[PDB]
Structure 1
């Protein structure tokens, strides 16, 4: 595997910035989300969302649009490893509305407080996030501290409408984030936020459409998660 140096990363960041506004490659398969990171990876010449730096270790490579308004960094996008599945949560806590029925669970969940549905998060160690309804346990996600310990986060200015085929991206700022704080307090103080998003056309014979649970943190709160935030570009 390719080993990078920090200087190589910084040089690459400048190389990309110097190209100006980049278009979305058409040979690239795309879903509804993640285009910024896809382009960033292509510009780094890599096929995954991480790179290994010499003695410094493995860094996630993440891209975001630059916005004045609030935005969120995604920390994970995955299913629980134990307890109730996302579908079993959806079946129980989702609600029905109409023409003919559709069922839905679009909810945001934090530690420290129950939300409108009675749902909340708890951690005993950083390593693990548990979904409860009130004091009843439901499911568990693992948070891989090792994966998020070290991050190269790159911001793009854009022209054109977000997620359109004609959108263009100019990567102009980047940061190296390391030295991760104990996440227990960030979960239990409501800093890290989970979302569940599942719905279903109850007339049809198609299964539920689960967009996949996310754990996210506001960009404005990154200094609560990382003790060392260094501007690279």
Structure 2
């Protein structure tokens, strides 16, 4: 694994921007929102996930399309340590609905954003006692507990891409034009409780093809507009 110095990251980001629009190799294409991140990883020579460290060593690397209205940033995934499993949650709260991409395919889905301070429309909410005790509730009923490790996201390199071509098509291209270094992370207990950080569940199941469920892992996420609540220092790199 290469450990990238800050100066090496800054230099590489300028080189990447100077390359202009980057294309998706045919062998890579798989109708995938995450392709922006795969392309960015290639530029940094990131060959596999490391269980211990952020992609670049000291820093974790994240790419995003620069949409006018931006989806949340996914920080990492983690299964609950205790209580109901994600599959047990899916069994109870999932709902039958056609695929959004292919209307002829029937699915069972649970795509829901859960946060502190509020019940969502499915009755789900979070609270936190410590960063190591984040609890999922349905109304006043305790379901599950997460013990989250934030080590890998202590420092981030976040890079934004402009796009040309249809989203998730083989012709989509990416020009990485802006980047930020985010450091000095805050304790997350209050951020969970106040609904700044959120948890997404992203489980579905292809019923038409008689397949088993696909749990993508509970996602800890944050809106880009609220990153200054998570990190005390945000520096423009590119």
Q: 1:209 to 1:7 in 2, by over 3 A?
A: closer
Partner residue of 2:62? Answer: 62
Q: How does 1:63-212 map to 2 (within 5 A)?
A: 63-96=63-96, 103-200=108-205, 205-212=210-217
* Deviation of the 1:55 alpha carbon: 16
Q: 1:69 to 1:49 in 2, by over 3 A?
A: farther
RMSD: 3.2
Q: 1:20 to 1:12 in 2, by over 3 A?
A: same
* Deviation of the 1:203 alpha carbon: 7.3
Contact 1:51 1:58 in 2 (8 A): no
After TM superposition, the score normalised by the length of structure 2 is: 0.85
After TM superposition, the score normalised by the length of structure 1 is: 0.87
Contact 2:161 2:176 in 1 (8 A): yes
Deviations 1:112-134 (A, max 9, x none): 11222221111111234221112
Deviations 1:5-34 (A, max 9, x none): 211111100111111111012233646331
Contact 1:50 1:61 in 2 (8 A): no
* Deviation of the 1:95 alpha carbon: 3.7
Q: 1:44 to 1:104 in 2, by over 3 A?
A: closer
Contact 1:122 1:188 in 2 (8 A): yes
* Deviation of the 1:206 alpha carbon: 2.7
Unaligned runs of 5+ in 1: none
In 2: Cα distance, 1:220 partner to 1:129 partner: 23
Please give the secondary structure, in 2, of the residue aligned with 1:3: coil
Aligned residues: 233
Q: How does 1:212-223 map to 2 (within 5 A)?
A: 212-223=217-228
Deviations 1:19-70 (A, max 9, x none): 1111012233646331111111101122146799999962101100112213
In 2: Cα distance, 1:115 partner to 1:77 partner: 20
Tell me whether 12-21 or 26-35 shows the greater mean CA deviation. 26-35
Please give the secondary structure, in 2, of the residue aligned with 1:129: strand
Tell me whether 118-127 or 198-207 shows the greater mean CA deviation. 198-207
* Deviation of the 1:161 alpha carbon: 1.3
Tell me whether 168-177 or 2-11 shows the greater mean CA deviation. 2-11
* Deviation of the 1:200 alpha carbon: 3.9
Unaligned runs of 5+ in 2: 98-102
